[PDB]
Design an enzyme around this catalytic site. Structure first.
Site, mmCIF file in Angstrom:
data_model
loop_
_atom_site.group_PDB
_atom_site.id
_atom_site.type_symbol
_atom_site.label_atom_id
_atom_site.label_comp_id
_atom_site.label_asym_id
_atom_site.label_seq_id
_atom_site.Cartn_x
_atom_site.Cartn_y
_atom_site.Cartn_z
ATOM 1 C CD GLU A 64 3.492 -11.026 -2.464
ATOM 2 O OE1 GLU A 64 2.873 -12.006 -1.568
ATOM 3 O OE2 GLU A 64 3.983 -10.161 -2.011
ATOM 4 C CG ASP B 150 9.305 1.770 -11.488
ATOM 5 O OD1 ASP B 150 9.723 1.357 -12.763
ATOM 6 O OD2 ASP B 150 9.018 1.130 -10.540
#
Ligand SMILES: CC(C)c1cnn2c(NCc3ccccc3)cc(NCCCCCCN)nc12
EC number: 2.7.11.22
Lengths: 279, 65, 286
Positions: free
Chosen positions: C11, C113
């Site tokens: 999640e 990232d």
């Protein structure tokens, strides 16, 4: 990059006849769907094309006065979205007025032109209720537009290739003293090329070079040596011949383009409004 | 089992683009805007913009559907 | 849909991830811009060391992306104390990271990232760059970016000083940080703030001077620091060979322009010397 892009793989077509085939399949498929659901109300494929030209022009007008200013890449992306959408879809199933706005919305997102929904719909010349309704419609159609584009969202436009060609001409082709003198006229031709199906039929580099060479020819300059010498096309004459033919075909498409007529647009808009009101 | 470098082999379907480090010597950089000291400090050089523009001009110029 | 859930995977702030049939599905603004960024970039990229986007679908404004299903990531392997990271394994991970990064940079895209959990491994041991939600094309002169990109521990000093315009140096500095984390098995520069991140950078690597970074002072959020001597790289990485120390130094050059690119890194002697990289099938499995 274009040479391994989805635009080259899936959205550059081999002929105007293939494009007409796709659009005709779309029109016929909608007619069959309507007949199964429930006739002069239907639109003919050439009338759909007239309306798509009209609403592409409307999309350009929308993007031009959009605040904050839309980068030209975003406008080109949205226009390409519009063309691709109506290759496989009928204007009587999805109204081009909403689809063009959804194209602009998705393009702004895709080209990293971060704008909030309120300012986007505030660019619309509508009441706040009308703007909110249009926003609702755009959000309804955003995923549909993405699906019809087959999730191919990056659009390679001719503008950066145009810049690179200008750099190359300034560096390597002194026989053309000031290549910047070709910009404005070439710019015009690019715009005129954009209204045709050329963006579905040729590479962005070919379109940019065609615009530059048309600008040069209108200027009284022949840069045949730029292709033969600087582009090193004297090694393989076949490549030079094919490029010359591609440019000739683009010039032919531009000369054979016809803008929609006012009376025809009025009649077809009434027919389209009937198509979306009925059923 | 020893690694050895080979350049990425991707066909561009267009004219050869000069190497990035060559651009300054070949006179291309005279036609793009110079990077500001802030840009250079961040690592952005006008060579990048020039190289990208040339690559986009040459990409798929010879390709046919 | 054509996919059936098998198990729950994770999640995130932007989405939730679940296994499916085998693939990994990442389920007034409209469609989320991070999902669109991943879609628009991954549709144009095809390379063995870049995560493959297989399908996308959804309803209304809710969208789901389909990717190849990976087994682990570099963060899991690094944090696993039951796995010995031999020099061959480190070289293999660095090689795949750099090959994917070379492909990405050649197509004028920065990942922005990079970190061990964004480097995923499949069961065959193929490393793929993933999580392109921050990735952005680079090279345009008129576009401006943000300096908050990259996780702070892996952020480049040019980013920490406020560089709006940058290049591949952000990814390569993150690559150097990933390499250091692989060598030390702990985050190299674990700062708690931007100021503390810069302080740790300069304490470990020495405070840069105008010679090694000529336009340092021109960056927006630049502030003068104490002139730290830094630690010799062989003192930080006592088991690093000279070629690996050369690679590390090139990745940790303060000047982003002088910082080695992915291709230059791949050409360095470290990758060609013995031992060769471990074959993907023999990389450690946690
Ligand atoms: C491309 C993307 C959608 C993808 C593909 N596979 N995959 C998996 N696979 C399972 C797994 C991977 C890596 C580590 C452990 C389990 C998990 C996930 N997100 C959950 C991360 C939780 C664990 C993080 C610990 N550092 N995302 C993906």
């Amino acid at each position: 990059m274009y040479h391994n892009s989805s635009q080259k793989r899936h959205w550059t077509f081999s002929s105007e006849e293939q494009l007409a085939r796709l659009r005709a399949d779309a029109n016929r498929k909608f007619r069959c769907k309507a007949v199964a659901n429930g006739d002069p109300v239907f639109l003919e494929p050439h009338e759909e094309m007239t309306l798509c030209k009209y609403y592409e022009k409307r999309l350009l007008e929308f993007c031009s006065v959009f605040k904050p200013a839309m980068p030209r890449s975003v406008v080109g992306t949205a226009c390409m979205y519009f063309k691709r959408f109506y290759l496989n879809n009928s204007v009587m199933e999805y109204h081009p007025r909403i689809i063009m706005l959804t194209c602009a919305f998705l393009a702004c997102k895709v080209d990293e032109f971060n704008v909030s929904s309120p300012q986007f719909v505030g660019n619309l010349r509508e009441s706040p209720l009308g703007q909110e309704k249009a926003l609702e419609q755009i959000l309804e159609y955003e995923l549909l537009l993405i699906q019809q584009l087959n999730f191919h969202l990056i659009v390679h436009n001719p503008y950066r290739p145009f810049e690179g060609f200008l750099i190359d001409l300034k560096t390597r082709y002194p026989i053309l003293e000031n290549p910047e003198i070709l910009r404005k006229t070439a710019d015009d031709f690019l715009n005129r090329i954009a209204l045709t199906d050329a963006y579905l039929l040729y590479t962005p580099s070919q379109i940019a070079l065609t615009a530059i060479l048309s600008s040069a020819s209108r200027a009284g300059i022949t840069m045949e040596s730029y292709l033969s010498e600087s582009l090193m096309l004297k090694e393989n004459r076949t490549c030079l011949s094919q490029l010359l033919d591609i440019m000739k075909s683009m010039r032919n498409l531009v000369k054979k383009y016809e803008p929609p007529r006012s009376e025809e647009v009025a009649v077809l808009k009434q027919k389209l409004e009937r198509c979306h009101s009925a059923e | 089992a020893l690694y050895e470098y080979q350049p990425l082999q991707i066909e561009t379907y267009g004219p050869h683009v000069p190497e990035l480090e060559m651009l300054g010597r070949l006179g291309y950089l005279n036609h793009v805007r110079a990077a500001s000291p802030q840009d250079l400090a961040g690592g952005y050089t006008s060579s990048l913009a020039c190289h990208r523009a040339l690559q986009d001009a040459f990409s798929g110029l010879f390709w046919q559907p | 849909k054509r996919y059936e859930k098998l198990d729950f995977l994770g999640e995130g702030q932007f989405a939730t991830v679940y296994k499916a049939r085998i693939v990994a599905i990442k389920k007034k603004d409209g469609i989320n811009r991070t999902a669109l960024r991943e879609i628009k970039l991954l549709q144009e990229l095809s390379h063995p060391n870049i995560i493959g986007l297989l399908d996308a679908f959804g309803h209304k404004s809710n969208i789901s992306l389909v990717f190849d299903f990976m087994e682990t990531d570099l963060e899991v392997i690094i944090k696993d104390n039951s796995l010995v990271l031999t020099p061959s394994h480190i070289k293999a991970y660095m090689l795949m990271t750099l090959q994917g990064l070379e492909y990405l940079h050649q197509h004028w895209i920065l990942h922005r990232d990079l970190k061990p959990n964004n480097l995923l491994l499949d069961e065959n041991g193929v490393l793929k760059l993933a999580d392109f939600g921050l990735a952005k094309s680079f090279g345009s002169p008129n576009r401006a970016y943000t300096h908050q990109v990259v996780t702070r521990w892996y952020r480049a000093p040019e980013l920490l000083f406020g560089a709006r315009m940058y290049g591949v140096g952000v990814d390569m500095w993150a690559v150097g940080c990933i390499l250091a984390e692989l060598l030390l098995r702990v985050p190299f520069l674990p700062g708690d703030s931007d100021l503390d991140q810069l302080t740790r950078i300069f304490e470990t690597l020495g405070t840069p001077t105008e010679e090694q970074w000529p336009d340092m002072c021109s960056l927006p959020d630049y502030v003068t620091f104490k002139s730290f001597p830094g630690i010799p790289l062989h003192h930080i990485f006592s088991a690093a060979g000279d070629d690996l120390l050369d690679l590390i130094q090139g990745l940790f050059l303060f000047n982003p322009c002088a910082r080695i690119t992915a291709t230059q890194a791949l050409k360095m002697k470290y990758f060609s010397n013995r031992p060769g990289p471990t074959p993907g099938c023999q990389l450690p499995r946690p």
